[PDB]
Protein backbone atom coordinates (compact mmCIF):
# COMPACT_ATOMS: atom_id res chain seq x y z
CA UNK A 1 0.00 0.00 0.00
CA UNK A 2 2.83 2.36 0.85
CA UNK A 3 2.45 5.96 2.04
CA UNK A 4 -0.91 6.54 0.34
CA UNK A 5 -2.45 3.51 2.07
CA UNK A 6 -0.85 4.72 5.31
CA UNK A 7 -2.53 8.10 4.87
CA UNK A 8 -5.86 6.35 4.32
CA UNK A 9 -5.43 4.21 7.44
CA UNK A 10 -4.46 7.23 9.54
CA UNK A 11 -7.62 8.88 8.20
CA UNK A 12 -9.67 6.35 10.17
CA UNK A 13 -7.56 6.66 13.33
CA UNK A 14 -7.99 10.42 13.40
CA UNK A 15 -11.51 10.75 11.95
CA UNK A 16 -10.75 12.89 8.91
CA UNK A 17 -10.81 12.44 5.14
CA UNK A 18 -7.43 11.17 3.87
CA UNK A 19 -6.66 14.59 2.39
CA UNK A 20 -7.01 16.30 5.79
CA UNK A 21 -4.77 13.98 7.83
CA UNK A 22 -2.26 16.33 9.54
CA UNK A 23 1.05 16.68 7.72
CA UNK A 24 2.97 16.36 10.99
CA UNK A 25 1.21 13.05 11.70
CA UNK A 26 2.00 11.66 8.24
CA UNK A 27 5.61 12.77 8.70
CA UNK A 28 5.97 11.23 12.16
CA UNK A 29 4.39 7.98 10.95
CA UNK A 30 6.84 7.68 8.05
CA UNK A 31 9.73 8.42 10.42
CA UNK A 32 8.37 5.80 12.81
CA UNK A 33 8.06 3.35 9.92
CA UNK A 34 11.66 4.06 8.87
CA UNK A 35 12.83 3.63 12.46
CA UNK A 36 11.37 0.12 12.68
CA UNK A 37 13.35 -1.05 9.65
CA UNK A 38 16.51 0.74 10.79
CA UNK A 39 16.23 -1.07 14.13
CA UNK A 40 15.43 -4.41 12.47
CA UNK A 41 18.74 -4.09 10.61
CA UNK A 42 20.87 -3.90 13.76
CA UNK A 43 18.67 -5.55 16.42
CA UNK A 44 20.26 -9.04 16.18
CA UNK A 45 23.62 -7.35 16.90
CA UNK A 46 22.55 -5.17 19.83
CA UNK A 47 23.22 -6.06 23.48
CA UNK A 48 20.04 -7.97 24.24
CA UNK A 49 21.05 -8.41 27.87
CA UNK A 50 21.35 -4.65 28.34
CA UNK A 51 18.01 -4.03 26.61
CA UNK A 52 16.32 -6.59 28.86
CA UNK A 53 17.82 -4.94 31.94
CA UNK A 54 17.17 -1.30 31.08
CA UNK A 55 13.80 -1.25 29.28
CA UNK A 56 10.57 -1.51 31.28
CA UNK A 57 7.07 -2.82 30.60
CA UNK A 58 4.14 -1.09 32.29
CA UNK A 59 2.07 -3.56 34.34
CA UNK A 60 4.16 -6.60 33.43
CA UNK A 61 2.79 -8.07 36.68
CA UNK A 62 -0.38 -8.86 34.74
CA UNK A 63 1.60 -11.46 32.81
CA UNK A 64 3.67 -12.73 35.74
CA UNK A 65 0.51 -13.32 37.78
CA UNK A 66 -1.10 -15.27 34.93
CA UNK A 67 2.02 -17.45 34.86
CA UNK A 68 2.05 -17.80 38.66
CA UNK A 69 -1.51 -19.15 38.32
CA UNK A 70 -0.21 -21.73 35.83
CA UNK A 71 -2.60 -20.53 33.12
CA UNK A 72 -0.23 -19.51 30.33
CA UNK A 73 -0.93 -16.28 28.47
CA UNK A 74 -1.71 -14.90 25.02
CA UNK A 75 -0.05 -11.55 24.34
CA UNK A 76 -1.99 -9.99 21.45
CA UNK A 77 -0.69 -6.75 19.98
CA UNK A 78 -0.96 -4.59 16.85
CA UNK A 79 1.80 -3.61 14.42
CA UNK A 80 2.95 -0.63 16.48
CA UNK A 81 6.36 0.47 17.69
CA UNK A 82 9.01 -2.25 17.53
CA UNK A 83 7.35 -5.51 18.57
CA UNK A 84 10.61 -7.36 17.88
CA UNK A 85 12.25 -5.30 20.64
CA UNK A 86 9.46 -6.32 23.02
CA UNK A 87 10.17 -9.92 22.03
CA UNK A 88 13.84 -9.44 22.92
CA UNK A 89 12.74 -8.00 26.26
CA UNK A 90 10.51 -11.00 26.96
CA UNK A 91 13.21 -13.49 25.94
CA UNK A 92 15.60 -11.81 28.38
CA UNK A 93 13.19 -11.32 31.30
CA UNK A 94 11.22 -14.58 31.00
CA UNK A 95 12.64 -16.83 28.28
CA UNK A 96 11.93 -18.05 24.75
CA UNK A 97 8.33 -17.82 23.57
CA UNK A 98 6.38 -18.96 20.53
CA UNK A 99 4.82 -16.85 17.81
CA UNK A 100 3.48 -17.14 14.29
CA UNK A 101 4.31 -15.55 10.92
CA UNK A 102 2.75 -15.39 7.47
CA UNK A 103 4.79 -17.52 5.06
CA UNK A 104 5.76 -14.69 2.73
CA UNK A 105 6.95 -15.02 -0.86
CA UNK A 106 9.60 -15.70 -1.97
CA UNK A 107 10.63 -18.47 0.42
CA UNK A 108 14.11 -16.91 0.55
CA UNK A 109 12.65 -13.71 2.02
CA UNK A 110 10.58 -15.75 4.47
CA UNK A 111 13.78 -17.51 5.57
CA UNK A 112 15.50 -14.14 6.04
CA UNK A 113 12.72 -13.15 8.45
CA UNK A 114 12.81 -16.50 10.27
CA UNK A 115 16.57 -16.16 10.75
CA UNK A 116 16.11 -12.60 12.04
CA UNK A 117 13.55 -13.48 14.71
CA UNK A 118 15.24 -16.77 15.66
CA UNK A 119 18.42 -14.76 16.29
CA UNK A 120 16.32 -12.72 18.75
CA UNK A 121 15.41 -15.91 20.62
CA UNK A 122 11.84 -16.49 19.42
CA UNK A 123 10.25 -19.69 18.22
CA UNK A 124 8.45 -18.68 15.01
CA UNK A 125 5.81 -21.02 13.54
CA UNK A 126 4.88 -20.73 9.84
CA UNK A 127 1.21 -19.89 9.43
CA UNK A 128 1.21 -22.33 6.49
CA UNK A 129 3.37 -25.25 5.37
CA UNK A 130 4.73 -26.36 8.74
CA UNK A 131 4.81 -29.83 10.24
CA UNK A 132 1.75 -29.30 12.45
CA UNK A 133 -1.12 -26.79 12.57
CA UNK A 134 0.27 -23.69 14.33
CA UNK A 135 -2.83 -23.42 16.54
CA UNK A 136 -2.23 -26.88 17.98
CA UNK A 137 1.38 -26.09 18.91
CA UNK A 138 0.33 -22.75 20.41
CA UNK A 139 -2.37 -24.44 22.49
CA UNK A 140 0.22 -26.91 23.77
CA UNK A 141 2.48 -24.00 24.73
CA UNK A 142 -0.38 -22.35 26.64
CA UNK A 143 -1.26 -25.59 28.44
CA UNK A 144 2.39 -25.82 29.51
CA UNK A 145 1.99 -22.41 31.23
CA UNK A 146 3.97 -20.53 28.61
CA UNK A 147 3.38 -17.17 26.91
CA UNK A 148 2.72 -16.86 23.20
CA UNK A 149 2.72 -13.63 21.20
CA UNK A 150 0.46 -12.97 18.22
CA UNK A 151 0.21 -9.99 15.91
CA UNK A 152 -3.53 -9.70 16.22
CA UNK A 153 -5.14 -6.71 14.44
CA UNK A 154 -4.98 -7.92 10.82
CA UNK A 155 -6.37 -11.02 9.10
CA UNK A 156 -8.28 -10.17 5.92
CA UNK A 157 -9.41 -13.67 4.96
CA UNK A 158 -12.80 -15.37 5.03
CA UNK A 159 -12.18 -16.80 8.51
CA UNK A 160 -11.15 -13.49 10.10
CA UNK A 161 -13.59 -11.98 12.59
CA UNK A 162 -15.38 -8.85 11.44
CA UNK A 163 -15.09 -6.10 14.05
CA UNK A 164 -15.68 -2.38 14.24
CA UNK A 165 -12.35 -0.55 14.35
CA UNK A 166 -12.32 3.25 14.53
CA UNK A 167 -15.95 3.17 13.44
CA UNK A 168 -15.51 1.03 10.31
CA UNK A 169 -15.47 -2.67 9.46
CA UNK A 170 -12.22 -4.63 9.43
CA UNK A 171 -11.24 -8.25 10.04
CA UNK A 172 -8.95 -9.49 12.82
CA UNK A 173 -7.72 -13.05 13.45
CA UNK A 174 -9.76 -15.31 15.70
CA UNK A 175 -6.72 -17.12 17.11
CA UNK A 176 -6.18 -15.07 20.28
CA UNK A 177 -9.79 -15.53 21.42
CA UNK A 178 -9.96 -19.16 20.29
CA UNK A 179 -6.78 -20.01 22.20
CA UNK A 180 -7.91 -18.26 25.39
CA UNK A 181 -11.31 -19.98 25.33
CA UNK A 182 -9.79 -23.40 24.63
CA UNK A 183 -6.93 -23.23 27.15
CA UNK A 184 -8.07 -20.76 29.81
CA UNK A 185 -4.91 -18.76 29.16
CA UNK A 186 -5.15 -15.07 30.01
CA UNK A 187 -5.70 -12.94 26.91
CA UNK A 188 -3.65 -9.78 27.47
CA UNK A 189 -3.71 -6.92 24.97
CA UNK A 190 -0.23 -5.49 24.52
CA UNK A 191 0.99 -2.24 23.02
CA UNK A 192 4.44 -1.18 21.88
CA UNK A 193 5.31 2.38 20.92
CA UNK A 194 8.35 4.61 20.52
CA UNK A 195 9.23 6.45 23.73
CA UNK A 196 11.75 9.11 22.77
CA UNK A 197 14.92 7.34 21.68
CA UNK A 198 13.68 4.26 23.56
CA UNK A 199 10.76 1.85 23.49
CA UNK A 200 7.48 1.95 25.40
CA UNK A 201 5.62 -1.27 26.24
CA UNK A 202 2.59 -2.12 28.35
CA UNK A 203 0.50 -5.16 29.26
CA UNK A 204 -3.19 -4.39 29.70
CA UNK A 205 -5.78 -6.16 31.88
CA UNK A 206 -6.82 -9.52 30.47
CA UNK A 207 -9.99 -9.67 28.40
CA UNK A 208 -13.19 -11.13 29.82
CA UNK A 209 -13.92 -14.50 28.21
CA UNK A 210 -17.18 -15.14 30.10
CA UNK A 211 -19.17 -14.70 26.88
CA UNK A 212 -17.43 -17.67 25.28
CA UNK A 213 -17.95 -15.73 22.04
CA UNK A 214 -14.93 -15.26 19.76
CA UNK A 215 -16.56 -12.28 18.03
CA UNK A 216 -17.38 -10.45 21.26
CA UNK A 217 -13.90 -11.10 22.66
CA UNK A 218 -12.14 -10.06 19.44
CA UNK A 219 -14.26 -6.90 19.42
CA UNK A 220 -13.06 -6.08 22.94
CA UNK A 221 -9.49 -6.69 21.77
CA UNK A 222 -10.01 -4.37 18.79
CA UNK A 223 -11.46 -1.70 21.09
CA UNK A 224 -8.32 -1.81 23.24
CA UNK A 225 -6.05 -1.69 20.18
CA UNK A 226 -7.98 1.35 18.96
CA UNK A 227 -7.54 3.12 22.31
CA UNK A 228 -3.80 2.41 22.35
CA UNK A 229 -3.22 3.35 18.70
CA UNK A 230 -5.12 6.58 19.37
CA UNK A 231 -2.54 7.41 22.05
CA UNK A 232 0.41 6.87 19.66
CA UNK A 233 -1.05 7.16 16.15
CA UNK A 234 2.31 7.75 14.45
CA UNK A 235 3.72 4.43 15.72
CA UNK A 236 1.10 2.15 14.10
CA UNK A 237 2.86 1.53 10.78
CA UNK A 238 0.00 -0.11 8.90
CA UNK A 239 0.99 0.55 5.30
CA UNK A 240 -1.06 -2.42 4.05
CA UNK A 241 -4.84 -2.30 3.59
CA UNK A 242 -6.63 -2.73 6.92
CA UNK A 243 -10.30 -1.89 6.44
CA UNK A 244 -12.42 -4.06 4.17
CA UNK A 245 -13.40 -1.19 1.86
CA UNK A 246 -9.71 -0.83 0.92
CA UNK A 247 -9.45 -4.39 -0.45
C1 LIG B 1 5.39 -6.48 26.60
C2 LIG B 1 5.39 -8.01 26.74
C3 LIG B 1 6.20 -8.71 25.65
C4 LIG B 1 5.60 -8.60 24.25
C5 LIG B 1 6.36 -9.41 23.19
C6 LIG B 1 5.71 -9.41 21.81
C7 LIG B 1 6.58 -10.07 20.74
C8 LIG B 1 5.96 -10.08 19.35
C9 LIG B 1 6.78 -10.86 18.32
C10 LIG B 1 6.10 -11.00 16.95
C11 LIG B 1 6.93 -11.80 15.95
C12 LIG B 1 6.23 -12.05 14.61
C13 LIG B 1 6.01 -10.77 13.80
C14 LIG B 1 5.91 -11.01 12.28
C15 LIG B 1 4.49 -11.32 11.79
C16 LIG B 1 4.03 -10.49 10.54
O1 LIG B 1 3.79 -9.28 10.78
O2 LIG B 1 3.95 -11.12 9.45
MG1 LIG C 1 -15.61 -13.34 33.29
Numbering used by the authors: 48 to 294
Text of the article:
Here, X-ray crystallography, site-directed mutagenesis and enzymatic activity data are used to define the three-dimensional structure, acceptor/donor substrate binding, membrane binding and catalytic mechanism of PatA from M. smegmatis. The enzyme transfers a palmitoyl moiety from palmitoyl–CoA to the 6-position of the Manp ring linked to 2-position of myo-inositol in PIM1 or PIM2. Our results reveal that the enzyme has an α/β architecture and shares with other important eukaryotic/prokaryotic acyltransferases an acid/base catalytic mechanism involving conserved histidine and aspartic/glutamic acid residues.
The crystal structure of PatA from M. smegmatis was solved using single-wavelength anomalous dispersion with a K2PtCl4 derivative at 2.06 Å resolution in C 2 space group (PatA–C16-1). We have decided to use the PatA–C16-1 crystal form for our description since it displays the highest resolution. The high quality of the electron density maps allowed the trace of residues 41 to 302 (PatA–C16-1), 48 to 295 (PatA–C16-2) and 48 to 303 (PatA–C16-3). Strikingly, one molecule of palmitic acid was unambiguously identified in the difference electron density maps of PatA–C16-1, PatA–C16-2 and PatA–C16-3 crystal structures. We believe that acyl molecule is associated to the enzyme due to the hydrolysis of palmitoyl–CoA during the isolation and purification of PatA from M. smegmatis mc2155. Interestingly, the comparison of the three crystal structures revealed conformational flexibility in the carboxylate moiety of the palmitate, located in close proximity with the lateral chain of H126. In all crystal structures of palmitoyl–PatA and PatA–S-C16CoA complexes, the carboxylate OE2 oxygen atom of E200 was found at 2.8 Å of the ND1 nitrogen atom of the aromatic imidazole ring of the invariant H126. It is worth noting that when the individual palmitate molecules observed in the three crystal structures of palmitoyl–PatA were superimposed, they showed important structural flexibility at the carboxylate region, suggesting that the carboxylate group is not in a catalytically competent position in the crystal structures. Our binary complexes correspond most likely to the hydrolysis reaction product of palmitoyl–CoA, thus one of the oxygen atoms found in the palmitate that interacts with H126 most likely come from a water molecule activated by H126.
